[PDB]
Antibody, heavy 216, light 214 residues
Framework: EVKLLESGGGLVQPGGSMRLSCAGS????????MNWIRQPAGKAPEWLGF??????????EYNPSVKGRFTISRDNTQNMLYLQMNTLRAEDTATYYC????????????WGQGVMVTVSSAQTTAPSVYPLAPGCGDTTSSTVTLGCLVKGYFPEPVTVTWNSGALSSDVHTFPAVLQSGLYTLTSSVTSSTWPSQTVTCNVAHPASSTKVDKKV | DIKMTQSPSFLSASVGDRVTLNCKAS??????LNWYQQKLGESPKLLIY???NLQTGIPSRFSGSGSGTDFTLTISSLQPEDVATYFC?????????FGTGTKLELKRANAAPTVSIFPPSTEQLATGGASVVCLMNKFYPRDISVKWKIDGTERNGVLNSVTDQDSADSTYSMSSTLSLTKADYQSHNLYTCQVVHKTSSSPVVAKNFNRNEC
């Protein structure tokens, strides 16, 4: 029960193949069925398949919707489960979760945090980060809203924080948007004591090991 | 395959109210129907299994019922930590199929937005690009419209984005972007963000700035 952890790449080009892996902590791996469920952003989960008990012989069933392309396997010796995907297509872009089946409380009594798999022939490109400070003769109250433009990056996601979490007051990080094959996103924060304090946004893009600290 | 339908898709209720979620299977599923709660940025979590069994650790305000082709999830009194999307799951037969889902929105008192406009950064410019930004924050209800206008003229090469209901004040925030080339950004002067909150106010809200400056 305690923990289910998925790992496995994210950006892959069409036609390729990929292997996600799921690890299970805190329970006898071998005594449970294990599942893979995926969910395309903005839509309901979709059940992929499962691998049986040790008792049922570790056999597998698959949702016909994918069957043929996906295979599931375990490594009972070290509590790992795997999902092998082949001929990745564009619609296979989604968050993939492994989920223990369970006894009584089932199916899916425990999920993992998921991992996004992005299928596309675009390339890993880091973001450009611009500070957003109130401009050209603009009045402003005692609490000023400031922001950061995170532009032209791929693929998702990026991470924005303020004053390294120290100022997590009024913070709004807006969902990304696809402008001609690249993601652009915006983040706002609020500060009384605007100028004399120092506000910095911390952006990070893992798909490029980018970590930027833009001061405003 | 067994196709699951849920209704309604969206649901706004006041904290403390009675809420009811519907799920219809297209074949008798007998008693095998589950409910999952998925909060923002989280993996679905099991609420109830086989039309009416609460799972360990879930509050008593939840209950399920119905049987065969129609099922219901009912929340006696809506808590703010119950704002989320809800999924129905048929599992008598493989492939196991989920329902379309239902999103709950906590209701609140109208709120006019705080609008804010940002001219391009000297840095973005120094690279011949220019994005004007308009943060349109903490408003309610969700319906709203923003328009950009360069020198009084409505414009379009825009990009909008709205957050999800905030867990702290139940408002919505929106960000709109206006991307131009440095050259075109320079052959104009007054940039504007006008928002109309079908509610809050009639005279509409406008924020601008003169590129040469006031």
């Amino acid at each position: 029960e305690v923990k289910l952890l998925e790992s496995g790449g994210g950006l892959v080009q069409p036609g390729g193949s990929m292997r996600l892996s799921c690890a299970g902590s805190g329970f006898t791996f071998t005594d449970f069925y294990m599942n893979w469920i995926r969910q395309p952003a903005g839509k309901a989960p979709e059940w992929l398949g499962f691998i049986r008990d040790k008792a049922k012989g570790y056999t597998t069933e698959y949702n016909p919707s994918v069957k043929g392309r996906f295979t599931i396997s375990r490594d009972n010796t070290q509590n790992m489960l795997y999902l092998q995907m082949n001929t990745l297509r564009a619609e296979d872009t989604a968050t993939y979760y492994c989920a223990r089946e369970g006894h009584t409380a089932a199916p899916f009594d425990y999920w993992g945090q998921g991992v996004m798999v992005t299928v596309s022939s675009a390339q890993t490109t880091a973001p450009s980060v611009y500070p957003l400070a109130p401009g050209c003769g603009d009045t402003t109250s005692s609490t000023v809203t400031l922001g950061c433009l995170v532009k032209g990056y791929f693929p998702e996601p990026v991470t924005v924080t303020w004053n390294s979490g120290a100022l997590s007051s009024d913070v709004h990080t807006f969902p990304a948007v696809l402008q001609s094959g690249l993601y652009t996103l915006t983040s706002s924060v609020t500060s009384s004591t605007w100028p004399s304090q120092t506000v910095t946004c911390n952006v990070a893009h893992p798909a490029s090991s980018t970590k930027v600290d833009k001061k405003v | 395959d067994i196709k699951m339908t849920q209704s309604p898709s969206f649901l706004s209720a006041s904290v403390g109210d009675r809420v009811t979620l519907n799920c219809k299977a297209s074949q008798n599923i007998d008693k095998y129907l589950n409910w999952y709660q998925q909060k923002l940025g989280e993996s679905p979590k099991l609420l109830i299994y086989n039309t009416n069994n609460l799972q360990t650790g879930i509050p008593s305000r939840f209950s399920g019922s119905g049987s065969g082709t129609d099922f219901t999830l009912t929340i006696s009194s809506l808590q703010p930590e119950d704002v989320a999307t809800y999924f129905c799951l048929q599992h008598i037969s493989r492939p196991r199929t989920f329902g379309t889902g239902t999103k709950l929105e906590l209701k609140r008192a109208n709120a006019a937005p705080t609008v804010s406009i940002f001219p391009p950064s000297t840095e973005q410019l120094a690279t011949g690009g220019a994005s004007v930004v308009c943060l349109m924050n903490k408003f309610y209800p969700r319906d709203i419209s923003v328009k950009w206008k360069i020198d009084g003229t409505e414009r379009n090469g825009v990009l909008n984005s709205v957050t999800d209901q905030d867990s702290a004040d139940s408002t919505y925030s929106m960000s709109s972007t206006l991307s131009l080339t440095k050259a075109d950004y320079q052959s104009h002067n007054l940039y504007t963000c006008q928002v109309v909150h079908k509610t809050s106010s009639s005279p509409v809200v406008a924020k601008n700035f003169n590129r040469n400056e006031c």
